[PDB]
Swiss-Prot record:
Changing T109K: Impaired PhoP repression by high concentrations of divalent cations. Changing T1A: Confers to cells a PhoP wild-type phenotype. No effect on net phosphorylation of PhoP. Decreases 5-fold initial rate of autophosphorylation and increases phosphatase activity. This is Virulence sensor histidine kinase PhoQ. Changing T1L: Confers to cells a PhoP constitutively inactive phenotype. Affects PhoP/PhoQ-signaling cascade but no significantly effect on net phosphorylation of PhoP. The chain holds residues 48 to 187 of 487 of the full protein. Induction: The phoP/phoQ operon is positively autoregulated by both PhoP and PhoQ in a Mg(2+)-dependent manner. Repressed by RcsB via sigma factor RpoS. Disruption phenotype: Abnormal expression of genes encoding virulence proteins. Decreased tolerance to acid stress. Decreases fitness in the spleen of mouse. 10,000-fold reduction in virulence in male BALB/c mice (for strain ATCC 14028). Double knockout with phoP decreases virulence in mouse. It is found in: Cell inner membrane. A divalent metal cation binds at D104, D105. Residues 1-140 are periplasmic.
Amino acid sequence: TFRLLRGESNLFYTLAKWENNKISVELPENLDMQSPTMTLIYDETGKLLWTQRNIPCLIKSIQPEWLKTNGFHEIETNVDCTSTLLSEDHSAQEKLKEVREDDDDAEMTHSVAVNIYPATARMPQLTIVVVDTIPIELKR
């Protein structure tokens, strides 16, 4: 889980560059866009610097306390938000349709790994957050 999302976090760390008070992430050519993760990068103060996808409901669901340490956490969000997160994913969209019909405020829980990268000569201190886009309720 955490140990598993750590790999994606490390990847995005090595992909990132710090230039002119800004994070830039250049994605590798032909990289899978269909991986079930979304990564966010914050500064040590907890300011969001970069996000793989701009999804405000999920971003607002990230608790600031979490951001100062390494940890494994859970987002408690809604089926509307999860549907926005999984928009491109066809099959998932079918399932999501179903669940939306049974309950329109159905709760969705997403695993999250928070990862700390101390400042180096190359890079300032960063917190990298990796979210499992498939919620616990849909894993089975």
